[PDB]
């Protein structure tokens, strides 16, 4: 049977999906907090060419 | 005396299933719970996490501090300076009161 | 990706929290002064309305 | 306290001065938490009336979710307007009465004399 | 005017004192309430006539209206109490102590 | 009169002790009269004379409590020469609770009243020193 | 005031006869009319804290 | 420790409960107490501000 | 009761507080209060039993006295300064007697001895109304004159309401009196902050209402009126134990439930005005309030009291209740603290 | 942090939407995986602590506690399968949900940058714990135990809330990064002393102190095995974490407002370790040993020296592990005879030879057998105190003696001696509980191998 | 037939289903178009951004 194989065993996507979603939200926070990117008395350096960002 | 069921009788869980692991009365469930526990606890966590931690570099800046202390003692013995000044902050940076 | 990312995120977080603290204190002084001195625009308490007055010529002159 | 401020329209939900604010994303965590409240409300309704959960009254659950997200969006626009007006009033009053809100002119730790409290 | 208002206030206070200090009978307390209503009506009418404010005379008549409605429902409750216990005594409605 | 009850703070502790005693005794009598009123109106007595008895009982008890509190407080301020110490007021509240027990004939009430009234009086002294506000005006 | 329905619909059920300086029958005038008028006109647009 | 902290708090609060809530269900006495409160408030006001 | 009578009476109940809210003149606030207390009585006495009649009497007499006092206050503020609505230039005696009478009506301590009885003697759907809809108009009055109220009096009243509510509901077996004392305590909270900020007393009122209404609904589900009765829910309606427990723990003021928000944001706004002691005592006694809610949770959900041989029948049969609003309100009364900024201002 | 919390949430739908048979396996496995995911916090290659947002963070102090909290969940689930085997599916799911909520709230508390979130969650950890105790405990004292546990904590916490709000009104923020750089000496006054009391007594009641510790043994005795484990291992560490975080803003009032508490802790250590001798209940013995151990943490935190904080962190971690282990061991025999008395079953080395090695190793970790980390903490705390006053080692040493004494008494009168031949119901050991003891022990070996992780901010 | 006392909610009430679905989709559409119009009004009230 294929339905009885997926009526159960489909719950094995929740927790991994949650991990992915949490990583996404952490990236969103990092994006929000970009007001000192390459503007810190330490790590403030001149930018390389083709380097559009010091970090996302 | 009011109605209730009598206190049941303890059971020997090995009676019906001698190959019992302690998890569930249904054997298949028992075996697979055992296997998942063992796998995800010992084979996965206690091994891969242990390695991940053993290969964390410069934990809290410990190797770097050693290398730099070597650099500094070298420089300071080679240039006559002492190995540690009793004052962290250059007094020029400090303006003490004009106490009178 | 470290270690500059965490450093700079921390700097930004500190900016944010310090600004919010400053503003909370500013609010707690502004409300005080508005409620003591009556200046606007908060803590303005109502007064009788002025357009329900009869400005028409009355029956007696001294009114 | 803000009730008696100039321009206060009595019984006005969105005074049309709030259309200068950045409206809220529809995937805002608050709206998709109101959505969870709606879903859990459908679930508890099915539970109390002795109905299968997660499989009964799918229209009812959808309705709950939509209503919750709707009220959320609009109430949230209003609350944003309110907090913005609060900041507006505060900054305006500070500009008007500066002598009561002067600068800090803070010194550096070279001139400050903080005492030392040992640990012995 | 001032002595009149002082005496009417003292009268309201006496009727309130009566209402608060129950005796066996309930109708006496209802009558004390009506006396407070009377005092207040008179005070309001005197004030409106002393101020020549003929736009506030509609107020005391409303006072009387609502006071009499209160009296009516009080009399109905009194009827029910008497039916229950046979008397309008207050020492009989003391079973809600639990 | 409120100037009377404020005469308690016209001079620091260890001074005009008898005046402090009289003031605190009057305050205790006040509180006891309030409690006796509430205890005769509610939970009334079999007889008016018995109600007056209850009144006098509660009132004299409260007055004795206040007397001991104020007296011991000013005495400790006079002896160890620490007028600004909440510990004197703690001792005073403790003596007041020991009284409260003597009257009720209960060592448990004595201990509880001690450890509660002492705390309360010490906090009252702390509030008079550090300028607290019990019923403050709205200022924001 | 708590629910300013009147000020919303633009009606007057209870507010046109509050104070003495309001319209009276046959254009009579309650005594202290001018004093009340001036008090109200001074207290307008500033609040009850300043008006005091 | 049981006597001191928990089994003293419990006794205190249950006794104050017995006091407060063991009423007689008579409106006469409730209104007498209301009068007591009226008088107390008027006295507080008179002495504090007049 | 016929539909015409029901219409008139319920429309009057509704209209009463509306007039009070929507009116500038104090006299019309008074007539609104009177509409309310005249229309509510027949709904109490409908059952026609001695308990209902005496509840009606104790309610009517008290509310009439309080209304006469409020009317005296209005008439004195008319004799003085020749206007109806109060003003900054009004006698503190007038203002304070008005506050006292409004408390008398609301049922605050020490003017509370009538509310537990009046709520025990009547049915539950009326206790709901009594404790939720009839506490607004007074609060409207108080919120329109909050700058003028004395802080000493309201604060004494509030600490008294807290202490007495706790100590009284502590040893109650009947549920209606427990709800009465909960009302007393939460009204003490509502009132302790009114002069400083009345946008928070309205919040506490809304929250207490959405909290008590579904509790009353639960009680009305099986007409439960005692601890021993609700102890039988595990056999009759076990799907209600979760919501019951959560609403109780919220009413008590436990995080992470939105019954803690009023407590917290009131303590805050009080210490912004240096009322450390008041807020401290209030919280320490709200703990005692929580205690008997917890004992009740024990009795109902966290353990299983004995049942009867007949409840098997109730198990056989079906049930149409509750409605949709119970779940809605019970969810928006426990799981909404995350939205507190939206709730507070 | 979301990558550790959102999986812990989705665990709930995984618990409820799962077939009655596969509900335990799935949740256990994914909880193990989440414990794994939590190991990234140890990637600290600098002195700059990890700030993930304005709300979530993890320093060297919170990371060990977070990992322990994520690792204890599957162990609790396992331990909680022999009981609940006869309970309905919904009850099992509810138990698992309680445990998951506890995990989540604790990870939040340890990740929180602000003290109000910390307080809200510190208090939210009462609901699931109380439910577990009163709903799945076995005796009637469940209810009094839950009452004590609630109200000690709340009566302690309310002043803490008042003090946090006061600090907010005075400073503008309750953030922990800001309150550390923007700090000011606290003028010595009765007001600030009461502030100290308010800020401390909630945690001191949760560690706990000696004078207030009666809520702990009642709970542990009347709590099911999972509740006992989480309580002992984490819900006490909660108070120490709070004190360590909040003691920066109480300087220097901690210099002279500590003597009472240092003293009570040092003395109650002896008192409790002595109680652990004349104690019929094994669970009560474990609880009083926990109190004796947390007394050292309290004293250490009170003197606030680097060695002190380090020893306190090590002792917290090690005691959590070993106490969870001892409660597991006790419940093993309980499930056979259904009695908590340590005198009934006193020859169990002749039937359970392997399970006795777990008893031995635990009781060796309970006492300070080196190079265990249960010993390094005690040693560095002893050193810090000796530096404080050279007369502390007297009490420390008599506590050491009593500790060895009652641990040896436990294992002797429980395993060694003549077997109780009437105990025909002594089924052999379950693979599951054996895995439990193994999972409690091996991490102790690994930490002893790498102690740099559990030192703390001071090192 | 399994229930002697024929149940309520045995076969659905379709008016409620239709009304619920219609209200849901209408509220979603109203909300989305209103959000877009609000974005546009904000942008054009300040420099299209
Ligand atoms: C996402 C988050 C979503 C969360 C949803 C709630 C979550 C569930 C828990 C809720 C419990 C807490 C509720 C607390 C609360 O509602 O605020 C208290 C809130 C606090 O009062 P307030 O801050 O002084 O604001 C009212 C103004 O003073 C009065 O003046 P105004 O100019 O501000 O006018 C009031 C305002 C209406 O706004 C409100 O007052 C609250 C929202 C009411 C929605 C109307 C439906 O405008 C209207 O009246 C609408 C006009 C249409 C006719 C009335 C309907 O209570 C009220 O406002 C009641 C006023 C009468 C309302 C009618
Ligand atoms: C925490 C407060 C708990 C208070 C203790 C209440 C209690 O004693 O439990 C009832 C217990 C009665 O035991 P029982 O007679 O076996 O329960 C049968 C009843 O008819 C009641 O159970 P039932 O058989 O009538 O209901 C069937 C339902 C079972 O559902 C229930 O009836 C109980 C659900 C209670 C909520 C527990 C969630 C806790 C979340 C913590 C975070 O089965 C399902 O289909 C599960 C669907 C999900 C239900 C909602 C669960 C929370 C959703 C969380 C998100 C995951 C989904 C997305 O006592
Ligand atoms: C922190 C919270 C605690 C809460 C409980 C934890 C529960 C989760 C358990 C998951 C398992 C991870 C346990 C973490 C400890 C493992 C550390 C480790 O073994 O690696 C480091 C170790 C020693 O090397 P190192 O740390 O670099 O020492 C340098 C100091 N100068 O390197 C080695 O020794 C590797 C040698 C392997 C041989 C096997 C036996 C020894 C290991
Ligand atoms: C205020 C303090 C009152 C002092 C205590 C006196 C108690 C008292 O007499 O009040 C109760 C009284 C009703 O008493 P009653 O039920 O008739 O029983 C017979 C009384 N021996 O109640 C009354 O007599 C009613 C009194 C109301 C009128 C008071 C006006 C007095 C004039 C000055
Ligand atoms: C002995 C020590 C004597 C000193 C007493 C001082 C107490 C002053 C506080 C106010 C009075 C409270 C009295 C009380 O506790 O309740 C007593 C009363 C029951 O009366 P009864 O049983 O006869 O007396 C028992 C005394 N053991 O039951 C009641 O009165 C309950 C109702 C009291 C409500 C008081 C509200 C005061 C509000 C203050 C603001 C106005
Ligand atoms: C800073 C340190 C903090 C210190 C706080 C410590 C917490 C103190 C509160 C915990 C104790 C709560 C009450 C439980 C006490 C145990 C008494 C008891 O169990 O026996 C009395 C009995 C009820 O017990 P039962 O279940 O029937 O079985 C035993 C029968 N003897 O019959 C009874 O008498 C009924 C029980 C009466 C208990 C009333 C409880 C009063 C409210 C608790 C205080 C809440 C805090 C108030 C704020 C201050």
UniProtKB/Swiss-Prot annotation, chain C:
It is found in: Mitochondrion inner membrane. Belongs to the complex I NDUFB5 subunit family. Accessory subunit of the mitochondrial membrane respiratory chain NADH dehydrogenase (Complex I), that is believed not to be involved in catalysis. Complex I functions in the transfer of electrons from NADH to the respiratory chain. The immediate electron acceptor for the enzyme is believed to be ubiquinone. Complex I is composed of 45 different subunits. This is NADH dehydrogenase [ubiquinone] 1 beta subcomplex subunit 5, mitochondrial. The gene is Ndufb5.
From Swiss-Prot, chain G:
A motif (Cx9C motif 1) lies at residues 32-42. It is found in: Mitochondrion inner membrane; Mitochondrion intermembrane space. Belongs to the complex I NDUFS5 subunit family. Mammalian complex I is composed of 45 different subunits. This is a component of the iron-sulfur (IP) fragment of the enzyme. Contains two C-X9-C motifs that are predicted to form a helix-coil-helix structure, permitting the formation of intramolecular disulfide bonds. Accessory subunit of the mitochondrial membrane respiratory chain NADH dehydrogenase (Complex I), that is believed not to be involved in catalysis. Complex I functions in the transfer of electrons from NADH to the respiratory chain. The immediate electron acceptor for the enzyme is believed to be ubiquinone. This is NADH dehydrogenase [ubiquinone] iron-sulfur protein 5. The chain holds residues 2 to 53 of 106 of the full protein.
Curated annotation (Swiss-Prot), chain J:
Its EC number is 7.1.1.2. The keyword Transmembrane helix applies. It holds the Pfam family Proton_antipo_M. Its main location: mitochondrion. Keywords: Electron transport, Membrane, Mitochondrion, Mitochondrion inner membrane, NAD, Respiratory chain, Translocase, Transmembrane, Transmembrane helix, Transport, Ubiquinone. It is an enzyme of class 7 (translocase). It comes from the Eukaryota. Core subunit of the mitochondrial membrane respiratory chain NADH dehydrogenase (Complex I) which catalyzes electron transfer from NADH through the respiratory chain, using ubiquinone as an electron acceptor. Essential for the catalytic activity and assembly of complex I. Belongs to the complex I subunit 4 family. This is NADH-ubiquinone oxidoreductase chain 4.
From Swiss-Prot, chain K:
It is found in: Mitochondrion inner membrane. One of its GO terms (biological process) is aerobic respiration. The chain crosses the membrane at residues 13-32. It comes from the Eukaryota. One of its GO terms (cellular component) is mitochondrial inner membrane. The keyword Nuclease does not apply. Keywords: Electron transport, Membrane, Mitochondrion, Mitochondrion inner membrane, Respiratory chain, Transit peptide, Transmembrane, Transmembrane helix, Transport. It is a single-pass membrane protein. Belongs to the complex I NDUFC1 subunit family. Accessory subunit of the mitochondrial membrane respiratory chain NADH dehydrogenase (Complex I), that is believed not to be involved in catalysis. Complex I functions in the transfer of electrons from NADH to the respiratory chain. The immediate electron acceptor for the enzyme is believed to be ubiquinone. Complex I is composed of 45 different subunits. This is NADH dehydrogenase [ubiquinone] 1 subunit C1, mitochondrial. It comes from Mus musculus (Mouse). The lineage of its organism: Eukaryota, Metazoa, Chordata, Craniata, Vertebrata.
């Amino acid at each position: 049977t294929l339905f009885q194989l997926l009526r159960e065993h489909w719950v094995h996507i929740l927790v991994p999906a949650g991990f992915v979603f949490g990583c996404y939200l952490d990236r969103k926070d990092d994006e929000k907090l970009t007001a000192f990117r390459n503007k810190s008395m330490l790590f403030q350096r001149e930018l390389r060419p083709n380097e559009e960002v010091t970090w996302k | 005396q009011w109605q209730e069921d009598p206190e049941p009788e303890d059971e020997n869980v090995y009676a019906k299933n001698p190959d019992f692991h302690g998890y569930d009365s249904d054997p298949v469930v028992d075996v697979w719970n055992m296997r998942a526990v063992f796998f995800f606890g010992f084979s996965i966590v206690l091994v891969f996490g242990t390695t991940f931690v053993a290969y964390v570099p410069d934990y809290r800046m410990q190797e770097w501090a050693r290398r730099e202390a070597e650099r500094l003692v070298k420089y300071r013995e080679v240039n006559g300076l002492p190995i540690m000044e009793s004052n962290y902050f250059d007094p020029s940076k400090i303006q003490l009161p004009e106490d009178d | 990706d470290g270690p500059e990312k965490n450093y700079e995120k921390t700097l930004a977080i500190l900016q944010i929290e310090s600004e919010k603290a400053e503003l909370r204190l500013k609010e707690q002084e502004v409300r005080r002064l508005m409620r003591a001195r009556g200046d606007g625009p908060w803590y303005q308490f109502p007064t009788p309305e002025k357009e329900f007055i009869d400005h028409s010529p009355k029956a007696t002159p001294d009114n | 306290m803000m009730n008696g401020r100039p321009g206060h329209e009595p019984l006005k939900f969105l005074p049309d001065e709030a259309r200068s604010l950045p409206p809220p994303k529809l995937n805002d965590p608050r709206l998709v938490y109101m959505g969870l409240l709606g879903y859990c409300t459908g679930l508890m309704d099915n539970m109390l009336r002795m109905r299968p959960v997660m499989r009964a009254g799918l229209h009812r659950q959808l309705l709950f979710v939509t209503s919750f997200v709707f009220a959320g969006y609009f109430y949230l626009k209003r609350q944003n307007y309110l907090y913005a007006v609060k900041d507006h009033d505060m900054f305006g009053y500070i500009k008007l009465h500066p002598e009561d809100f002067p600068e800090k002119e803070k010194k550096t730790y070279a001139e400050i004399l903080e005492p030392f409290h040992p640990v012995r | 005017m001032p002595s009149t208002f002082f005496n009417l206030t003292m009268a309201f206070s006496l009727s309130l004192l009566g209402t608060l200090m129950f005796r066996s009978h309930l109708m006496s307390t209802l009558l004390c309430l009506e006396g407070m209503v009377l005092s207040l009506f008179i005070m309001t009418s005197v004030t409106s006539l002393n101020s020549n404010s003929m736009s506030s005379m509609p107020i005391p008549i409303t006072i009387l209206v609502f006071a009499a409605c209160e009296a009516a429902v009080g009399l109905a409750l009194l009827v029910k109490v008497s039916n229950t216990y046979g008397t309008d005594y207050v020492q009989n409605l003391n079973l809600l102590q639990c | 009169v409120k100037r009377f009850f404020e005469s308690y703070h016209e001079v620091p502790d260890g001074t005009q002790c008898h005046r402090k005693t009289y003031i605190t005794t009057a305050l205790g009598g006040i509180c006891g009269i309030i409690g006796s009123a509430y205890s005769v109106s509610l939970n009334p007595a079999d007889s008016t004379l018995e109600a007056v008895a209850r009144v006098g009982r509660y009132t004299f008890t409260a007055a004795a409590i206040g007397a001991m509190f104020g007296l011991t407080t000013c005495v400790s301020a006079q002896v160890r020469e620490k007028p600004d110490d909440p510990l004197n007021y703690f001792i005073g509240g403790c003596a007041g609770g020991l009284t409260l027990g003597a009257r009720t004939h209960s060592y448990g009430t004595a201990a509880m009243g001690c450890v509660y009234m002492g705390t309360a009086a010490a906090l009252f002294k702390i509030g008079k020193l550090e300028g607290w506000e019990l019923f403050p005006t709205p200022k924001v | 005031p708590f629910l300013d329905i009147q000020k919303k619909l633009g009606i007057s059920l209870d507010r046109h006869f509050m104070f003495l300086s309001a319209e009276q029958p046959y254009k009579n005038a309650a005594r202290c009319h001018a004093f009340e008028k001036e008090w109200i006109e001074c207290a307008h647009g500033i609040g009850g804290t300043r008006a005091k | 420790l049981e006597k001191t902290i928990p089994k003293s708090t419990s006794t205190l609060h249950t006794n104050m409960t017995t006091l407060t809530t063991n009423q007689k269900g008579l409106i006469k006495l409730y209104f007498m107490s209301f009068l007591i409160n009226i008088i107390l408030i008027i006295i507080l006001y008179s002495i504090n501000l007049e | 009761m016929n539909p015409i009578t029901l219409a008139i009476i319920y429309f009057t109940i509704f209209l009463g507080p509306v007039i009070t809210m929507s009116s500038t003149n104090l006299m019309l606030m008074w007539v609104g209060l009177e509409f309310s207390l005249l229309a509510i009585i027949p709904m109490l006495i409908n059952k026609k039993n001695p308990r209902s009649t005496e509840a009606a009497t104790k309610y009517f007499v008290t509310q009439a006295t309080a209304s006469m006092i409020i009317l005296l206050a209005i008439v004195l503020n008319y004799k003085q300064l020749g206007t109806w609505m109060f003003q900054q230039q009004t006698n503190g005696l007038i203002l304070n007697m008005t506050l006292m009478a409004l408390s008398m009506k609301l049922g605050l301590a020490p003017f509370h001895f009538w509310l537990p009885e009046v709520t025990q003697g009547i049915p539950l759907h009326m206790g709901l109304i009594l404790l939720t809809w009839q506490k607004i108009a007074p609060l409207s009055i108080l919120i329109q004159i909050y700058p003028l109220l004395n802080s000493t009096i309201i604060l004494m009243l509030a600490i008294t309401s807290i202490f007495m509510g706790a100590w009284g509901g502590l040893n109650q077996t009947q549920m209606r009196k427990i709800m009465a004392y909960s009302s007393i305590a939460h009204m003490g909270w509502m009132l302790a902050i009114l002069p400083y900020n009345p946008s928070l007393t309205l919040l506490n009122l809304m929250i207490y209402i959405i909290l008590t209404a579904p509790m009353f609904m639960a009680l009305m589900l099986n007409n439960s009126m005692t601890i021993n009765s609700i102890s039988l829910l595990w056999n009759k309606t076990p799907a209600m134990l979760t919501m019951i427990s959560l609403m109780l723990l919220s009413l008590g003021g436990l995080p992470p439930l939105t019954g803690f928000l009023p407590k917290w944001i009131i303590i805050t706004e009080l210490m912004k005005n240096n009322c450390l002691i008041m807020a401290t005592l209030m919280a320490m006694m709200a703990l005692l309030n929580l205690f008997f809610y917890t004992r009740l949770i024990y009795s109902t959900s966290l353990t299983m009291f004995p049942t009867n041989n007949n409840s098997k029948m109730m198990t056989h049969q079906t049930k149409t209740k509750p409605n949709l609003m119970f779940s809605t309100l019970a969810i928006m009364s426990t799981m909404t603290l995350p939205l507190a900024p939206q709730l507070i201002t | 942090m979301l990558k550790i919390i959102l999986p812990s949430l989705m665990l709930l739908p995984l618990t409820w939407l799962s077939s009655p048979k596969k509900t335990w396996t799935n949740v256990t496995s994914y909880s193990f995986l989440i414990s794994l995911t939590s190991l990234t916090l140890l990637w600290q290659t600098d002195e700059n602590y990890k700030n993930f947002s304005n709300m979530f963070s993890s320093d060297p102090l919170s990371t060990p506690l977070i990992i322990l909290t994520a690792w204890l969940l599957p162990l609790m689930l396992m331990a909680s399968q022999n009981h609940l085997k006869k309970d309905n599916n919904v009850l099992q799911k509810l138990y698992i949900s309680m445990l998951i909520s506890l995990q989540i709230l604790l990870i939040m508390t340890f990740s929180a940058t602000e003290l109000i979130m910390f307080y809200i969650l510190f208090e939210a950890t009462l609901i699931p714990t109380l439910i577990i105790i009163t709903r799945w405990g076995n005796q009637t004292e469940r209810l009094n135990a839950g009452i004590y546990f609630l109200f000690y904590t709340l009566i302690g916490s309310i002043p803490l809330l008042i003090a946090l709000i006061l600090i907010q009104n005075h400073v503008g923020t309750l953030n922990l990064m800001i309150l550390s750089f923007t700090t000011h000496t606290l003028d010595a006054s009765w007001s600030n002393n009461l502030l100290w009391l308010a800020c401390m007594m909630a945690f001191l009641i949760k560690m706990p102190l000696y004078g207030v510790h009666l809520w702990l043994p009642k709970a542990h005795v009347e709590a099911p095995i999972a509740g006992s484990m989480i309580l002992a291992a984490i819900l006490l560490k909660l108070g120490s974490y709070g004190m360590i975080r909040i003691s920066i803003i109480l300087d220097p009032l901690t210099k002279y407002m500590a003597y009472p508490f240092i003293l009570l802790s040092l003395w109650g250590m002896i008192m409790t370790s002595s109680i652990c001798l004349r104690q019929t209940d094994l669970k009560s013995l474990i609880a009083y040993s926990s109190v004796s151990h947390m007394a050292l943490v309290i004293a250490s935190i009170m003197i606030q020296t680097p060695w002190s904080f380090m020893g306190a962190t090590m002792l917290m971690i090690a005691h959590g592990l070993t106490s969870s282990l001892l409660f597991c061991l006790a419940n093993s025999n309980y499930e056979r005879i259904h009695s908590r008395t340590m005198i009934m079953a006193r020859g169990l080395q002749m039937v359970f030879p392997l399970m006795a090695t777990w008893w031995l190793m635990a009781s060796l970790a309970n006492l300070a057998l080196p190079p265990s980390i249960n010993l390094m903490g005690e040693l560095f705390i002893t050193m810090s105190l000796f530096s404080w006053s050279n007369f502390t080692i007297i009490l420390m040493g008599i506590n050491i003696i009593i500790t060895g004494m009652y641990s040896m008494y436990m294992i002797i009168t429980t395993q060694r001696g003549k077997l109780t031949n009437h105990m025909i119901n002594l089924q052999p050991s379950h693979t599951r509980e054996l895995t439990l003891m193994a999972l409690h022990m091996i991490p102790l070996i690994l930490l002893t191998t790498s102690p740099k992780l559990i030192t703390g901010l001071t090192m | 037939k399994f229930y002697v006392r024929e149940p309520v909610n045995a076969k659905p009430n379709w008016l409620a289903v239709g009304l619920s679905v219609g209200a849901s989709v209408f509220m979603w559409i109203y909300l989305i178009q209103t959000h877009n119009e609000d974005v546009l009004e904000y942008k054009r009230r300040n420099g299209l951004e």
